[PDB]
Design a protein around this ligand. Structure first.
Ligand code: 2XK
Ligand code: 2XK
Lengths: 41, 231, 255, 274, 58, 59, 41, 274, 59, 41
């Protein structure tokens, strides 16, 4: 992985992000909801 | 830009080269390996397993009988069977050994030839197997055969006799394709005493012959086989 | 004091004994075992009936005559109607199992004959019609009756020339598969232990037969003068390390 | 290094290594030194060329197909006119490589493809056109091309290669089986149905490779023949079986022709003939 | 490495993980081990091919 | 000049390859990143969000 | 042996296995059989 | 470094280095300093260019053959029509390299081949076709091609090279002899037979190289001539012999023409002529 | 992709060059060497052995 | 001198042997003969 070019845009693909946090989409609720506890208490 | 000079051969496609190449499916994650019994790493592993030889290939068509070597009662010093040792042709051509051997140009090493008696338990017999190394003709009578590598087999509780065909050669490799300079010699079997059947027994008696390679074995120069075609 | 000749095998409440065996074969030198977590995929907790399915089941005896060509059974098919094992096969989506095959055939020291007993993994049969004809489900699922290699072809069925192993390969090389011989002058029985062999951790037990068992006469049967020109051959099979998964309603299969 | 044969002399014992019982199903490792007097010799051999990695590790032609560059005006069925063509990926169409693969039951490996395209102008032509070929992989589920100029050739997600005719295309593909290994044989069906197909044809739904010529038509017609080569790498094989003996008749099934010549040679003489 | 499913057995509690209220706008991360008896299995998968870098990267 | 041998495939355009290439706009300075909520890294993240199924597609 | 590509499939041939154990095929018997001893005791 | 001649002065002794007896079979290493007064001089020479590795280490043409691209319709014998051709591998067809190799009895080395293919269109043609050549090695025992389009060209196991006409093909081959070295001469036969062949023609059964043009035919006919070059590397040679004096007549045998011109020049004058 | 510039001579076949080339027979194991008397390493070795001169080439 | 290929046959020329012993051809006599001493004593 030797960069032959001067600019960043020249480099190849970034490689896996390895972050993977779905909660900002699956659980965007204000009050935390614990699996197993009443959804509506 | 790094100065380069392209050499002759550039652009060629050598079916045998072994280089790297870009993956058409980047980031693809192949299925996990699970355990599967019977893994094979080298063809030399499997040619050590013996398979049946269709020694009696004297029939009009292919058939179970091609594997049955007839043995006759009260015959004495007579010949039971014979064959040259071109393992890539003749009786051997269809066997696992012959089949694999044909995927290569050169071979060397020792062969493992065995015979299993199937005649009634109360019957008896003494046969003599013989390997005649190259240089002379295939033996024409027991005496001639016995003068070379041989084994006197006594039929008994242990049903199978295993005669090895020790690598006997000057040049250290022979061609799988039948070639005179590299001929391997001849294999023959005779009656040492005779086959004796018990009372109330008249059925035909047969021998089953097997062929396999010893760890001794070597095969070189991979090539296409004459055992398949289309279109 | 012991010998390869004499053996006992006990699975569940069934026990077979033999005083004239020739050792025993364990396919690819591997004893059957259960599916380990590292190899598993299906998340369902499996069911292990153990002793109620891992026992010896004896099929109808075949009759070896001077003209027999051979017989072919398929597993798990051959045991689909065998007690609780069979029931579990149809009530579950998936399952895996190993077996202990025991083929029996006794005669006298005056008879002569040699049977080849072999286990072939993924024995994909060929259509006798050639070209690109298929082999209908029914014909590769004969049940415990198995396929008789000396019976005539039939529309939709497989070819049966013993010589070409029902698949375009020569009989003589069948020995590359885990096998054993029942040579009347030496043998009385043949025993083969089969571990689960597949490219998947577990599979459907009805739409796929993992191995087929073949009993093929090589050296023809010969009986002493004036004796009955036949001998019976009996096949006894016992599943082992059997796992069933994905239980649902009972499956309904072709015919 | 390794000894090929140890030195062994005369023998007279109750230990008879050459007397066995093949009905056990075993092939006792008997050696020449067990039945004759031998001298010491070495192997000077590793058997590297018979390693399965080497055996399946070289390029073999697995398919030949044809496409052509010509006026598409009026042509209703582009596929039939061969304005573009298909290849239902499979490795059992050409028998040479097939017999090798079928020496085993299960097989796992990565594949390295090399695609060669050669031009031909059978009729009158003033020059040889400089055509560019586009080979696009169409995985099962992807829309198939209907015309040599579909929107499908945009190939936004399907991987595809563009290369000049006369030149060669090359790339490798990881092991794509759904299981842990590929099946060379499959004693089963897609489901428990009375009429459904039998054999690995049920497991081999690998998709298609669509080939076309990107150039518009020239005054003359150009015939481009495409040859696909396959080389396996990082090989693994399981359960060796009996080699194929009879000729093949169909892709994927073990079927063999009715009335075929005997495979075993018949002696020109006796069973005693040399 | 990563577990795809943990081993889970019989269940009889007041903690009902499979009863939720989708009107909250959330997709509770319910697993097979929450409604059936499961065995242990591993992922043997990272999901590298579904990374946006890969998705738009060709 | 370093002796080389070009391999088959040279010249091909594989829509899937991932190599370096010269920048047509050297020294260009892209706009600074600012924070934007809802970043997605993997499609496996979003398929975990459920959507309605048109089960009664009998119309 | 420098890998120019990111994926494993891109690399060249594996090189000799160097395992070579034929016994799982030549001697798949339950009770060990010693060369020289009675095959059937 | 090394001295070419040492300094030697007057001499008057009973040690006569220049009196020998050639019937012993030896060539006593007599030097100029043994018969004349010499000064000191150095070699400034290693003799690197006369090393056998260098002598046989350069490419020499070993065979020229021809194949052609044309309509195959109606042609019964493809081989004869040269739709494809053969080369029974051997290195004694073209005399230049042969004489060098035959300076020794036994020879061992790896070979580096370079194959050049040149097109030619003798008759009327509108353009020069862009043909691709396929050279496939057919080891003894492999099925030989019968038609330029056999299944044999699948070359699943046979190694083969594909390259453009006008371009050049290159690859090396390890020492493939069956013995420890190749024989340049062989005073023997294949077996003890009254009529069988004599000479190395008995040992040289190296197989064939089949050449063909992958492209289908064009309207015109194209003649492709193939030239194979051989360069030895990692050389070893044994038992040097007398150089070849008379012209060759056949591949492999030492035969020479009946009625050949004398090889030794005849003096234009006396035995005293300068 | 590493930027390169091909120099004049590229593509030529110089019968005298000495470069590497791919082996057409990978993994092939050549026959073991055995001892053979009379090995020659340099032609300068053998021209030191004398041979007869056809001085009287007057025939 | 970096070998790009896996097999030995692929490598280039060997380089000068640097052995150079002509005596096995020029002096293959049983009894050593010293220059200056009677060839036939
Ligand atoms: C170059 O053409 C391609 C071929 C293939 C098929 C493949 O690699 C394969 C190999 C062996 C077996 C077996 N047995 C099954 C499939 C795939 N593919 O499967 O994705 C993609 C291709 O272009 C991306
Ligand atoms: C390039 O063409 C090939 C040539 C050869 C023959 C070879 O290398 C040889 C060299 C010298 C002598 C002597 N004396 C004997 C044989 C082989 N081959 O023998 O395998 C393969 C080829 O293509 C794989």
């Amino acid at each position: 992985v030797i960069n032959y070019y001067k600019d960043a845009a020249s480099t190849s693909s970034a490689g896996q992000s390895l972050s993977m946090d779905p909660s900002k989409f699956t659980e965007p609720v204000k009050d935390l909801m614990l699996k197993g506890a009443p959804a509506l208490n | 830009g790094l100065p380069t000079t392209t050499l002759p051969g550039s652009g060629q496609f050598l079916t045998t080269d072994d280089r790297q190449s870009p993956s058409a499916l980047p980031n693809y994650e192949p299925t996990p390996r699970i355990h599967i019994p019977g893994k094979v790493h080298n063809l030399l592993e499997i040619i050590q397993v013996d398979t049946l030889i269709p020694m009696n290939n004297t029939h009009t068509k292919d058939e179970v009988n091609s594997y049955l070597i007839p043995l006759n009662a009260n015959r004495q010093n007579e010949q039971v069977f014979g064959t040259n040792l071109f393992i890539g042709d003749g009786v051997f051509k269809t066997t696992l050994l012959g089949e694999i051997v044909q995927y290569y140009t050169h071979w060397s090493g020792s062969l493992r030839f065995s015979l299993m008696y199937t005649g009634p338990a109360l019957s008896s017999a003494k046969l003599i197997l013989a390997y005649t190394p190259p240089g002379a003709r295939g033996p024409q009578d027991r005496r001639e055969a016995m003068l070379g590598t041989h084994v006197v087999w006594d039929i008994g509780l242990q049903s199978t006799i295993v005669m090895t065909i020790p690598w006997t050669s000057g040049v250290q490799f022979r061609y799988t394709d039948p070639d005179t300079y590299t001929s391997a010699g001849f294999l023959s079997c005779w009656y040492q005493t005779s086959l004796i059947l018990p009372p109330e027994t008249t059925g035909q008696v047969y021998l089953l012959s097997f062929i396999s390679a010893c760890p001794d074995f070597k095969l070189r120069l991979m090539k296409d086989t004459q055992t398949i075609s289309q279109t | 004091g012991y010998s390869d000749r004499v053996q006992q095998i006990t699975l569940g409440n069934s026990t077979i004994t033999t005083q004239e065996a020739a050792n025993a074969v364990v396919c690819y030198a591997e004893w059957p075992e259960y599916l380990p977590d590292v190899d598993a995929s299906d998340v369902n907790k499996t069911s292990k009936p153990d002793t109620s399915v891992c026992r010896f089941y004896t099929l109808d005896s075949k009759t070896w005559t001077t003209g027999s060509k051979g017989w072919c059974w398929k597993l798990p098919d051959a045991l689909k109607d065998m007690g609780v094992f069979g029931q579990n096969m149809f009530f579950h989506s998936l399952g895996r199992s190993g077996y202990t095959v025991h083929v029996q055939c006794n005669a006298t020291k005056f008879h002569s004959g040699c049977l080849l007993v072999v286990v072939i993994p993924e024995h994909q049969l060929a259509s006798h019609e050639g070209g690109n004809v298929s082999v209908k489900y029914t014909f590769t699922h004969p049940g415990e009756r198995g396929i008789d290699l000396s019976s005539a072809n039939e529309v939709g069925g497989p070819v049966k020339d013993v010589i070409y192993n029902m698949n375009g390969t020569l009989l003589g090389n069948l020995l590359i598969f885990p096998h054993q011989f029942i040579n009347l002058r030496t043998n009385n029985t043949a025993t083969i232990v089969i571990p689960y062999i597949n490219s998947v951790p577990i599979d459907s037990m009805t739409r796929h037969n993992n191995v087929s068992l073949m009993v093929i006469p090589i050296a023809p049967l010969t009986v002493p003068t004036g004796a009955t020109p036949s001998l019976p051959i009996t096949v006894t099979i016992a599943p082992m390390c059997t796992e069933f998964s994905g239980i649902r309603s009972k499956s309904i299969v072709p015919q | 290094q390794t000894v090929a044969s140890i030195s062994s002399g005369p023998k007279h014992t109750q230990k008879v290594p050459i007397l066995t019982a093949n009905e056990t199903g075993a092939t006792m490792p008997v050696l020449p030194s067990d039945s004759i007097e031998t001298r010491t010799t070495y192997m000077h051999f590793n058997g590297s060329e018979t390693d399965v990695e080497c055996f399946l590790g070289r390029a073999a032609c697995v398919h030949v197909t044809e496409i052509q560059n010509k006026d598409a005006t009026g042509i209703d069925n582009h596929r039939e006119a061969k304005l573009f063509n298909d290849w239902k990926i499979n490795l059992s169409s050409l028998v040479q490589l097939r017999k090798k693969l079928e020496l085993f039951t299960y097989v796992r490996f990565d594949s390295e493809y090399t695609i060669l395209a050669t031009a031909s102008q059978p009729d009158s032509a003033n020059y040889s056109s400089n055509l560019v070929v586009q080979a696009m992989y169409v995985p099962p589920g992807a829309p198939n091309p209907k015309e040599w100029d579909d929107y499908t050739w945009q190939s936004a997600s399907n991987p595809s290669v563009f290369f000049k005719v006369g030149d060669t295309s090359r790339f490798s593909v990881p092991y794509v089986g759904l299981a842990s290994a590929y099946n060379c044989f499959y004693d089963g069906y897609s489901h428990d149905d009375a009429e459904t197909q039998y054999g690995i044809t049920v497991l081999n739904h690998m998709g298609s490779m669509a080939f076309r010529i990107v150039n518009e038509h020239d005054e003359h017609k150009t015939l481009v023949k495409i040859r696909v080569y396959h080389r396996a790498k990082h090989v693994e094989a399981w359960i060796p079986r009996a080699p194929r003996a009879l000729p093949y008749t169909s892709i994927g099934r073990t079927n063999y022709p009715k009335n075929t010549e005997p495979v075993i040679k018949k002696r020109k003489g006796d069973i005693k003939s040399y």
